[PDB]
Design a protein around this ligand. Sequence first.
Ligand SMILES: O=C(O)CNC(=O)C(=O)O
Ligand SMILES: O=C(O)CNC(=O)C(=O)O
Ligand SMILES: O=C(O)CNC(=O)C(=O)O
Ligand code: NI
Ligand code: NI
Ligand code: NI
Ligand code: NI
Lengths: 459, 459, 459, 459
Amino acid sequence: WDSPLRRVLAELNRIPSSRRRAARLFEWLIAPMPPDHFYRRLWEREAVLVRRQDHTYYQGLFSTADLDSMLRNEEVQFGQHLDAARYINGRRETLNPPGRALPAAAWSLYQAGCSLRLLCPQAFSTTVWQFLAVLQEQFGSMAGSNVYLTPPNSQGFAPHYDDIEAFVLQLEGRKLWRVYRPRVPTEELALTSSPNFSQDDLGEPVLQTVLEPGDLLYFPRGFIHQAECQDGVHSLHLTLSTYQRNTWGDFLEAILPLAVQAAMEENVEFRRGLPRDFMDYMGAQHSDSKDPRRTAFMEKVRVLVARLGHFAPVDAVADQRAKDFIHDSLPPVLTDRERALSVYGLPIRWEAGEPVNVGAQLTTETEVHMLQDGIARLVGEGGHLFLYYTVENSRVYHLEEPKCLEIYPQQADAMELLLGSYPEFVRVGDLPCDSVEDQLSLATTLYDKGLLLTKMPLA
Amino acid sequence: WDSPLRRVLAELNRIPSSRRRAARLFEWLIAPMPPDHFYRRLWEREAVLVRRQDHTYYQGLFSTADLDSMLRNEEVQFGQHLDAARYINGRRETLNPPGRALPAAAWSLYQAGCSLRLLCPQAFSTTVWQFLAVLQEQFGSMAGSNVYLTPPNSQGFAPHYDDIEAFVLQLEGRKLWRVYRPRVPTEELALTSSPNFSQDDLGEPVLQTVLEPGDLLYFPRGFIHQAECQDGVHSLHLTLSTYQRNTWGDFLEAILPLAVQAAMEENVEFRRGLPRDFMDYMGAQHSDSKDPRRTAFMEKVRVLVARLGHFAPVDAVADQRAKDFIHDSLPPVLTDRERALSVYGLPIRWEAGEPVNVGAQLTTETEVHMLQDGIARLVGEGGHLFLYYTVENSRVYHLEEPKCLEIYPQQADAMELLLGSYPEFVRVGDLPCDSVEDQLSLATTLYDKGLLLTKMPLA
Amino acid sequence: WDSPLRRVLAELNRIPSSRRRAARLFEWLIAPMPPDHFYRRLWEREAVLVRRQDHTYYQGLFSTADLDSMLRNEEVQFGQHLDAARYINGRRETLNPPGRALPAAAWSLYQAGCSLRLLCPQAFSTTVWQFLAVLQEQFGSMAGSNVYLTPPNSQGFAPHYDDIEAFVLQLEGRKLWRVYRPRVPTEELALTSSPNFSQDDLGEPVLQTVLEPGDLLYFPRGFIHQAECQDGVHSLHLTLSTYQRNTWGDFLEAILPLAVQAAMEENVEFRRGLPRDFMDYMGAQHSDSKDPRRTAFMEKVRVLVARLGHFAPVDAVADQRAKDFIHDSLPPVLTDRERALSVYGLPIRWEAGEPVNVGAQLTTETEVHMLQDGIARLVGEGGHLFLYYTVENSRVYHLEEPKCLEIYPQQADAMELLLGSYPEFVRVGDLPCDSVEDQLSLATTLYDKGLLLTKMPLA
Amino acid sequence: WDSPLRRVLAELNRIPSSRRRAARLFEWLIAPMPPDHFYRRLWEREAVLVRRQDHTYYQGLFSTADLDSMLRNEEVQFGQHLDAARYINGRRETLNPPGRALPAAAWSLYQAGCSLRLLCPQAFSTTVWQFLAVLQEQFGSMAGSNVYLTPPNSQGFAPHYDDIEAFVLQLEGRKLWRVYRPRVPTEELALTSSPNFSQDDLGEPVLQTVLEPGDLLYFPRGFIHQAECQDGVHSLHLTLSTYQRNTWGDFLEAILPLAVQAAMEENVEFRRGLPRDFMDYMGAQHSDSKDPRRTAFMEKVRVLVARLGHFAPVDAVADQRAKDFIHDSLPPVLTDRERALSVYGLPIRWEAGEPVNVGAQLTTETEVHMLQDGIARLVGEGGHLFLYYTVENSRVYHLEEPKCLEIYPQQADAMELLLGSYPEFVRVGDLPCDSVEDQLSLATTLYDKGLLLTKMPLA
Ligand SMILES: O=C(O)CNC(=O)C(=O)O
Ligand SMILES: O=C(O)CNC(=O)C(=O)O
Ligand SMILES: O=C(O)CNC(=O)C(=O)O
Ligand code: NI
Ligand code: NI
Ligand code: NI
Ligand code: NI
């Protein structure tokens, strides 16, 4: 009734800092490999196998039993929540009947040699939720997961790459995995998922191995992979994915239109007229021209492009990606102390015909900090100040719109101070505001919204 | 019956190249100032006044009498075609009753002190159309016009700047003009039109002068200007306009997103993942962060942006701007020769119950060149090659959608040759083509659309 | 140079009432057959042939020569303006090259046996305009036209029926026409155009005849018809069309949803709750049920539909249809008298630097009547009162948007009087308004818009 | 652990027929008054107070304790889920802070003086879900409910009337209600919710009582009502609501456009052209006319409308409303026996390592019937046969699309049979199909979708 995993979880509960929690969990996830080694040399470059030598490593995360109660007690739909898949004679085809996915239907598909894939494990299981909710804080990119249940003597899926950084957690059974290097430069760190491939289309595997429970297998986006079950045992695995559209390229995409517009507003060379007659030497039809105006034009394009770095709003865009990450974020999993010290742990309830324990209000004396570290971001838009937060997000991606509350200019400095000083308590009375009304109102607002905690329970 | 203008038109009819006709008329427009001096020093830099000392210079172009017949014989509409406005006691009013602009309404508005503005003189005047259609060819930019009639002792419009390069042709009467240099760096070569300014907002004119018929005033976008009729005499002028959104910045706007897209598809530095914690040091909150990872991130942006220049498809963007110019352009004005030697000049008509003078096909002995030099442009899009042309455009702006015909790859070299050797004749049989048929095919196709003239009439 | 057509138009210009003009021209159009006989017994009932015995009857209306000038001097396009079609071996081919329809393209198509179909003759021909604009006034419905030119020894089009009442006016040459009664009850007075039919689909013609210039052929919507040119001569005809979607059913479609909505607002029977269990006895599955609640339900539906007649806003729907007709209508063709006595005839012009002949205002002594009888209609919408008018419409269908001016409540009676008493003159001072100022101002507005004429010119 | 409510549910769980269950529960709901009396003279006419003399009638349904838990354990939002309302000094006020509804916020709004309205108790409560699911089966119309919780000495909501038939169940505390007869003819059986009224707009009540636990207070749409908590005690009630837009009027709205369309296709008088001159005597300007042609037009509009009943597709519209109802319907509550005899009862599951308890397929000897009576409906669209069902609906209104499966016509008569013949069993081998493959495939299909039960479990 215990695993390394239930222990690491019990551990996370005791570490006060969300930042520290995430770092710790990631260490665990890849142990004995050190994070720092992994991130500096292996991540995005190398396929990685961690032979755990433990069969009980991930016990308490997720299991086929979990799925079977899920099909029975939760409204799981084919195509929305669960897939049914078969690769045979170099040909894959989905077999989801439309509508609800009942055990009866599901298990019949298993018995016919269809794998089952559950698209949002974190919606229906609180242990996957917590796992992902913690790890996303150290990835600075949303982490989602798919759970893959493959029957004996069969392959579910075709060889292919994905558009995310993959962590395969083997959960039950065994599977033969083949992983390859990218076939060409343009497939390295591929931007979008590949078509399903055929076996002719592949080279040699860089890594071929039989995974077993507790084992972990990681490979960057672009690394083609397949996986089969061999001798009368099955596979269960959870693959954890992150880093979707989180490239330098995606950063520039957002920076550029702004930079050109800043440059055109602020500097008259970007507002000058094109030549009257550039059409006489620019264009496909003239790509071979030896007119020297051609090479002047090119050279001016190149410097003007270069000169836009100076006008790029790197900070504003970082904030905008921060805002999208908040929106993308799973809502936080509280420690017991965190809940107990917050609005969620106030003991006010309904007891025999009335509400009992109206709590204390917060005073200048109350000491406070941000509930956690990875749940809020302050962002300027149109000369206004908004705090976006994760605490009301659903455990389905984007099920809620992005949530935020205004921060008035007078309260700005205090908010920045709060965000920047987690996890160090601070007197409400000591927040850098003009009045005492402002100090209270800020903290009250933040406390009521489930963003703040007090050193000692209000009641 | 004769004027400097009617002589220069007659002269244009005898100059065989449309390139040369355009150069000549601009030379005429600014005479005696040299075009190369003007474009090298004054264009985009400085207001310019040309005291013609010839009050007949522009006769035949446009007169108030034309305006009057126009109101009576065409469907001229307030708002769409004609504004009537009054500047008094520092306010700008607009008095456009809705609907038709009859002579009776228009002339009473004028009698109450209203200035009348014709928005598209070139829709109702063949002499204005021809003027602009020739000039657009040596501007590389659409040339617009507006005609302004002001009654004695009034100002129609409040001071402002325009977003276009303006040439003011004083046609009747006299007007006192004031033109000011740009007030501040950001209004030099301004991007968009000004609001109505008050006289408290102005500095000192750089030029204040009373224009008389025949004179010319030019001032760049961003130069504020205002005008009034002074004692006992009205004014008519035509302002010729061009260079709307035709700047280096506009070219960059289109280039950038293509460039970033090509860099991501072609180079993995762009495909690399952002740091997992850039949010810790980047954002409005960290403007003044000493952290060594901010300056290293900023530095990388500046170098990646610089590297986009190597990826910029400059030629394809030039073709896209050329295609928009073809779409923006007035349909061409043919010389007597160009008409006679083209499809428009074919003698074929209906005569006494049937068609007669049914003409000869072209042969491989037929000698050809493009009908004019500013009527067509070859553009590549999505693997295919298209010839966009102006000969079916309307004298109303964008009343027609962009027009083209497909050029197959076999025919591309011949097409490129024809565009590039205007106005030298080429035997159809001497065209780069893989077959005689291919030779005939392209020539026939271009002749029928009115894109081609033969050395001798087909009939 | 004189023809029965040119005489009847010269006659129309001397008939002071537009109502009378419209009735006169229809009498002419079907002479010697009396209109009252035609509309009582033949209209919507029978195909009618009128052998004119006068090849000159229509001379002046439209000729193939007019088509030729129109291809050359107007921007006539294929598709938009002009179809080129061929019917052979039982198959309708359209051969419209895209773009301009120059004479050379069009006549070669005609020489390859294509007929040409001009879609909006009234846009390019003032005499067809006049013809249609006059006739619409006695149809109560838009009068459209197409011109069909067919070469010798060919058929342009497959047999078919159209959705309009058709009048075929043979202009040149000869054509062998066949017209068929409705093949079936459901095709009598058909609602929409037919597909192209083969000859296997056709019964026996009710009329088969060779038309010669001056003849007329009429047949109702749903009568199939086809036509070929036979021994070495061409044909040119003009088909006049009208009564598109102008039925009692069309009137009902609009009446019903207003009637139901008023019944529900004004009477509680319509508001009561359906029977809690009607689904047990009503539905396809209970077609042949015997439950006596099914037949009680059916009888309640029959009585409630019946009762909706009492709530039908018949007059309002009449006005909406009239407003649609105002929008649909061609702009009016003024007699010389009407032009002289209106705002269009006003002699104010620009002359040598100045307007001249500034004419008097209306006074309460001016006598006035509406410019014509079918240029305006007063329509109540949403508590306000609007006068919709046709004088600013274009000769292209719906090229302008419906046009009205607000008629304030105080002016209603005067407006109604004017509309209802054309063509009797009324002194402005005799109009039913509350003030003299109100009398002058209604009249001035109408006059200025071109809706009114004065017994004597204002100048 | 017992109440009249749990007994009637326990009673309900032994009644084999869903129809009978629904009838039974409604009887219990208004006990001791007979349904047959209520529906025949009370429903839609009268206010109705059922004094229960039994404070424990509804115990088990919903309590303020259930609310508290829900705030605490479910993601309940202000606006979407909960409302916080205060009626004071004659003004309604909404006091919802954006976002989540936590006990803290909720109970302080309670103690400030706000009522708390829960807009979808059936989403969070299984008992209320069962209640309504059962009742809707005997309303033929969606049953939905709101729970209102008002603190002592306040009023939450101003006087108003509603667009539904209301059943107020008093659950806790006591409220003094006032109900009113409709104020005027047009308010009787009102179509849309009234505005908030003042105590001026009101009349003198028709009913005025202090409600008490176990009581019920019914009244029809249009009936005004307000309700306060006087000295010393709170209120908790659940109002059940139905008959939103289920009127004769609404039936006719859907019937008519199709009636006219059918009439125009099937009968030529509905397709005959309007008079050419109706505009001369029809329209608001002629509402006074004495033209006898007008009275003929009116009389003709009237008969044509009355004639539309013959063409009304009454059955098709019944089926469409039936389809809308299946879409609006709560998913069913199975009995223990229904569960056991269906696909949901199958004992199939994931034992330690494998699936086990694979049920038997069905055979021609299996005895089948519809899972319940109010869960499916056969509808014809475009000669296609679709069986719309409710078994996958959510407990949130229209959260899902209308769900269905296609009945092929070989199965048609068999499907019809089952629907018509519940709750009595039928051999699969006796179903009216051509072949045995059809017999089986229909029953299988219906079984796996949760639509069909077997006499004995398949395992
Ligand atoms: O005519 C005036 O008073 C103002 N005219 C213009 O602004 C112009 O020609 O561009
Ligand atoms: O002229 C033809 O061959 C066909 N004519 C028509 O279809 C017509 O006038 O309605
Ligand atoms: O509970 C209240 O105060 C008011 N309730 C209602 O208006 C209702 O049930 O319809
Ligand atoms: Ni994968
Ligand atoms: Ni200007
Ligand atoms: Ni026809
Ligand atoms: Ni209510």
